[PDB]
């Protein structure tokens, strides 16, 4: 899922010096919400391996994956990869690495704490709309693991302190808001752990050689197509479309360079805006993403209202938004977009609930006041000009757009090269092919777009000598 | 760019950027002038202390409130307040920040016209908009229906909203507010032996009111208890000593809200105006208004006001309805939170009164559909 | 394929696929418009609430029935009703589904022509047909003779049929129906101190009329009983409390059917019109017509209407004639059941009006012998 990116540095004399690794666009929605036929990250399943008994009893982990709420919603287990020796291999790789085993144990215990965040329960009060917990055993054990106080954590979750002017005041939270905050905290702590791990790996990998010009290597998820497309697939499709637009612009620049080299210069119209017409209906204001982000802020929003607003603001007014199609008994379709890869339809249901990422400031302060390493991950988190978005005003889509923009401010500074890998068949048998599979691979790889852009100009170019030695015999 | 949300309010000016969870700057709206001569030469005292600075020099200044009940009465003081807020509090140039302003219902149109003229001419704000306090309060409360009671320091009013549709004929406005409560507290403290007259001691009386006063669930029972028991007496420390103890005067000051006959007002209490406003609306929406009673404003912050008002409304209303009162802990700043939410909406960006529109149509553009 | 049986009626649109036991979608035929302005922005309210949605927003909408008395007076509203019925309640595209329509006897030809034109042009149905609302009710009763009294909300009519041969010269139509009864109840409830004026609370009054009103066997005796005792009084709970009690008004509302002079109409009562239509026919079929009285329509659902009507008609009719009244429990939906039965017939498949036939012959095809 995450956009792995490795920068390979070189010395002054053009010799290999060092390697720098970075990560981008890691998806947080997978942690909490999973599709019915899909699993979560391999981490949680690997921890539940029974071949290591010490971790389970020292963390007081229930050995049954069914009991845990965060995991059981998706498909429980598949025969993808045998988790046991993979977990032992990762543990061995960590052991032979630069840091000690106490950090590894902190990693496992933090993951176990993330696991126990789903057991939290809350109920309404006597004669008030405020929410109070009923059970506290899971809260007690989680606080014991994090080295916090259960009473303080519960008070922070139920009654978040906020700063107004020069005085602190307490805010009220209902059940829905506290559940959203609990999910957002679990996603955020996982993100911070992953980023810190990446920084540690980069530091360990680092050599003392000077870093002159580098060669970047970028790996990104493809233009995945399903019959049940959702928000997670929408973000991936939008990122892939941005990358395809970048490739189209680069190829147009190369074609213009060749034209000016050969002195054969016509059709100066840029090849970017044709694809950017679809981009402008996603990231720009009054786009799909902007309307989605606004809608969740309205406290009475519902899926029907969101669909009605999309139809009012985009049906017929835009050149890409259009009605969905019902084919071969597909389960649901609400709206259909047109991309470089064809017609894609997405399902609205469930988008509004999972877009919210309201973080809690007092819980982050409590983490900073903790007695564990966790304070390092949450060291800095959230007058003469400020635009600091509030904790409530936090959407996954906004973070996705920000990360994509900061990635484009970095990738555009380097001359790009493209490598495409195509699976020949769905089966392991060599030689045989699946034609629809190759069609789908070509469509998602953008080769059809490349040949289409090449075909509108003059794609066939032959030297005068070759033309004479082949076609002069005609007259 | 980013939007700016400024709430002039009454007795407290609170402002901050849109998309924030709380106002950055909160300070009293006071302009003070030195009333003495001044003998030291070289310091060069300024001729006007504005904002929270006047609180520090409270003992040598005449504190004047620029607004009485919502309406601005001293415009020059209001330019001073706005300039202080924009420069010494937020440290931003309003030349590139749209400004959202909050304004109470049923006020003179000249007030809004002058407000917009000042914003567009003196500060040259690119765009601005004026909204009603009750709508913002309902925004911040996470609701789409229900009748909201906004009681600040300037004026108390109720605005019933159902499904995002207002009922203008059912809007009731009452001028009883926190300032009148402070004045009645002064009038009732002198019967014990403490006299407060100067405008500097207005702040002391207000602080006593904020710190000690509370609303009694029953009036006669509490008076009977206080006539014999002395468990209701609490001491307060003045800024120079001579602690004062107040007995039944602590729960008698906020009773003016439910008994406006104490200060000579003819109208009825807030618990009765809310019921009358509910019965003003249509018969098919009275249940939802009953079940979504919303509170906001600083004056509604007294301990036990929610229980008293619920008991009164339950007495008034038919016995077959469930009366529920929503009192979030952040009543005081609810309006500004609603303003931040409103300004952060994407579809609101086309409802601003731009500079071109104001230039073309004059100050009268405010009363168009961009209400 | 399948056929759609739509029954517009008046005040209740009921529809469903042919061959079903009961109609699938039943909802009032009203169109609502917001009469207020709306202060909350970003919600994006629609400009017209149609169907059962408007019943939930009665308090902020004005309700207009697109059908006054059988005929359609607001064609845009009727088109909205039809579109809602086809695309939301049934969720079936009418492109490949024939439709069967119903309307009252003795209606303007322009109404039928415009209905046919709209249904071929706007919706592009493959075929359609119009049937009398009384003949279908006769089918649904498993009969082939006798008269049928279709007292709906818009119009009341009698159609005598003997052995499948209709008698056009004996058809009697009366404009008194459920809407007039509701209006009369609204008028006479004022004498008890309850005022209902808004179109929204007309629905409330209709609820009281449905729930409590009943037809008295004797008028003078029930009047004396209600004036002397108080055992006939019942209480109804309004949507906002304040339970109200109705006494003598309980049975005065439905008596307008047998006493049209209460609302000022000169025409005779229901029983008298039925008897006049019976004797308007021939002399050799009067016995069968007497023995097969059929009741249908919502208005004929009052408790005790059958006994009173039988007593009245027996008083009018000769003593040596047996009088029977058929009152099935499903009077309200009888017309749609008959329509479904008719559309399920195999011999009826050749009576549809094909789109090509309409194009070749024009809108006047329906009135032509190709009925
Ligand atoms: N805890 C409290 N108890 C009682 N009264 C309070 C409390 N806090 C504030 N007030 C009163 O509320 C007033 C502030 O109201 P405010 O919300 O500023 O009104 P506006 O929004 O119109 O400016 C003060 O004058 C003060 O008397
Ligand atoms: N049991 C009942 N008691 C009183 N009124 C009734 C009853 N049933 C139906 N009605 C009245 O009949 C009307 C609906 O009749 P309906 O047959 O649906 O007319 P249409 O077929 O023209 O739509 C309603 O207005 C309702 O008030
Ligand atoms: Mg206020
Ligand atoms: Mg009918």
UniProtKB/Swiss-Prot annotation, chain A:
Residues 404-426 are annotated as: Actin-binding. It is found in: Cytoplasm, Myofibril; Cytoplasm, Myofibril, Sarcomere. Residues 1-475 form the Myosin motor domain. It comes from the Eukaryota. Changing residue 273 to V: In CMH1; infrequent. The modification Phosphothreonine is found at residue 136. Signal peptide: none annotated. The rodlike tail sequence is highly repetitive, showing cycles of a 28-residue repeat pattern composed of 4 heptapeptides, characteristic for alpha-helical coiled coils. Belongs to the TRAFAC class myosin-kinesin ATPase superfamily. Myosin family. Muscle myosin is a hexameric protein that consists of 2 heavy chain subunits (MHC), 2 alkali light chain subunits (MLC) and 2 regulatory light chain subunits (MLC-2). Interacts with ECPAS. Interacts (via C-terminus) with LRRC39. Myosins are actin-based motor molecules with ATPase activity essential for muscle contraction. Forms regular bipolar thick filaments that, together with actin thin filaments, constitute the fundamental contractile unit of skeletal and cardiac muscle. It is linked to Cardiomyopathy, familial hypertrophic, 1: A hereditary heart disorder characterized by ventricular hypertrophy, which is usually asymmetric and often involves the interventricular septum. The symptoms include dyspnea, syncope, collapse, palpitations, and chest pain. They can be readily provoked by exercise. The disorder has inter- and intrafamilial variability ranging from benign to malignant forms with high risk of cardiac failure and sudden cardiac death. The cardiac alpha isoform is a 'fast' ATPase myosin, while the beta isoform is a 'slow' ATPase. This is Myosin-7. It comes from Homo sapiens (Human). The gene is MYH7. The chain holds residues 243 to 726 of 1935 of the full protein.
């Amino acid at each position: 899922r995450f956009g792995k990116f490795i920068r390979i540095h070189f010395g002054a004399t053009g010799k290999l010096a060092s390697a720098d690794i970075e990560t981008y666009l890691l998806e947080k929605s997978r942690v909490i919400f999973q599709l019915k036929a899909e699993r979560d990250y391999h981490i949680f399943y690997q921890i539940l391996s029974n071949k290591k008994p010490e971790l389970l009893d020292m963390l007081l982990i229930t050995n049954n994956p069914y009991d845990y709420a965060f995991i059981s919603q998706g498909e429980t287990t598949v025969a993808s990869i045998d988790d046991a020796e993979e977990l032992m291999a990762t543990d061995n790789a960590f052991d032979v690495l630069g840091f000690t085993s106490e950090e590894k144990n902190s990693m496992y215990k933090l993951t176990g704490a993330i696991m126990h965040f789903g057991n939290m329960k809350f109920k309404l009060k006597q004669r008030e709309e405020q929410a109070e917990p009923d059970g506290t055993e899971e809260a007690d054990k989680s606080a014991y693991l994090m080295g916090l106080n259960s009473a303080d954590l519960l008070k922070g979750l139920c009654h978040p302190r906020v700063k107004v002017g020069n005085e602190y005041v307490t805010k009220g939270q209902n059940v829905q808001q506290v559940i959203y905050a609990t999910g957002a905290l679990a996603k955020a702590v996982y993100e911070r752990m992953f980023n810190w791990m990446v920084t540690r790996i980069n530091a360990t990998l680092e050599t003392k050689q000077p870093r002159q010009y580098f060669i970047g290597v970028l790996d990104i998820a493809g233009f995945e197509i399903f019959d049940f497309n959702s928000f997670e697939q929408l973000c991936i499709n939008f990122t892939n479309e941005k990358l395809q637009q970048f490739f189209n612009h680069h190829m147009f620049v190369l074609e213009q360079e060749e034209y000016k080299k050969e002195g054969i210069e016509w059709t100066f119209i840029d090849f970017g805006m044709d694809l950017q017409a679809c981009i402008d209906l996603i990231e720009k204001p009054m786009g799909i993403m902007s309307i989605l982000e606004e809608e969740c802020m309205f406290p009475k929003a519902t899926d029907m209202t969101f669909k009605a607003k999309l139809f009012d603001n985009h049906l017929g007014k835009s050149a890409n938004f259009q009605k969905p199609r019902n084919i071969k008994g597909k389960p649901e379709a609400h709206f259909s977009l047109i991309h470089y890869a064809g017609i894609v339809d997405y399902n609205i249901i469930g988008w509004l609930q999972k877009n919210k990422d309201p973080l809690n400031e007092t819980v982050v302060g409590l983490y900073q006041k903790s007695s564990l390493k966790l304070l390092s991950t949450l060291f800095a988190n959230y007058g003469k000009g400020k635009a600091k978005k509030g904790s409530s005003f936090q959407t996954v889509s906004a973070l996705h757009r920000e990360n994509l923009n900061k990635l484009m401010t970095n990738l555009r500074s380097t001359h790009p090269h493209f490598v495409r890998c195509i699976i020949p068949n769905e089966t392991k048998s060599p030689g045989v092919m699946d034609n629809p599979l190759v069609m789908h691979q070509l469509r998602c790889n953008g080769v059809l777009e490349g040949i289409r852009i090449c075909r509108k100009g003059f794609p066939n170019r032959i030297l005068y000598g070759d033309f004479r030695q082949r076609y002069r015999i005609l007259n | 760019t980013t939007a700016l949300v400024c709430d002039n309010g009454s007795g407290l000016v609170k402002a901050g950027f849109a998309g924030d969870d709380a106002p950055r700057a909160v300070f009293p709206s006071i302009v003070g002038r030195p009333r003495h001569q001044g003998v030291m030469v070289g310091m060069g005292q300024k001729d006007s202390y504005v904002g929270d600075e006047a609180q520090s020099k409270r003992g040598i200044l005449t504190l004047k409130y620029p607004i009485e009940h919502g309406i601005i009465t001293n415009w020059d003081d209001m330019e001073k307040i706005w300039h202080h807020t924009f420069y010494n509090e937020l440290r931003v140039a309003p030349e590139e920040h749209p400004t959202l302003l909050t304004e109470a219902p049923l006020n003179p149109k000249a007030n809004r016209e002058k407000m917009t003229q000042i914003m567009f001419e003196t500060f040259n704000v690119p765009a601005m908009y004026v909204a009603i306090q009750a709508v913002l309060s309902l925004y911040a409360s996470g609701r789409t229906t229900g009748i909201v009671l906004d009681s600040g320091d300037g004026v108390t009013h109720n605005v019933p909203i159902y499904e995002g549709y207002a009922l203008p004929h059912a809007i009731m406005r009452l001028d009883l507010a926190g300032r009148d409560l402070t004045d009645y507290l002064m009038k009732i403290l002198t019967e014990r032996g403490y006299s407060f007259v100067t405008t500097a001691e207005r702040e002391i009386v207000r602080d006593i009111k904020e710190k000690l006063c509370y609303v009694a669930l029953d009036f006669e029972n509490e008076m009977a208890t206080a006539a014999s028991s002395s468990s209701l007496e609490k001491s307060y420390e003045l800024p120079d000593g001579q602690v004062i103890t107040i007995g039944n005067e602590r729960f008698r000051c906020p009773e003016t809200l439910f008994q406006p006959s104490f200060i000579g007002m003819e109208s009825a209490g807030i618990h009765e105006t809310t019921y009358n406003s509910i019965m003003k609306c249509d018969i098919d929406i009275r249940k939802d208004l009953y079940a979504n009673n919303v509170l906001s404003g600083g004056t509604t912050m007294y301990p036990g006001i929610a229980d008293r008002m619920q008991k009164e409304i339950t007495a008034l209303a038919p016995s077959t309805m469930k009366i529920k009162i929503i009192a979030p802990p952040e009543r005081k700043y609810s309006v500004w939170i609603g303003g931040s939410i409103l300004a952060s909406l994407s579809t609101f960006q086309q409802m601003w009164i731009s500079k071109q529109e104001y230039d073309e149509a004059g100050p009268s553009i405010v009363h168009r559909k961009c209400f």
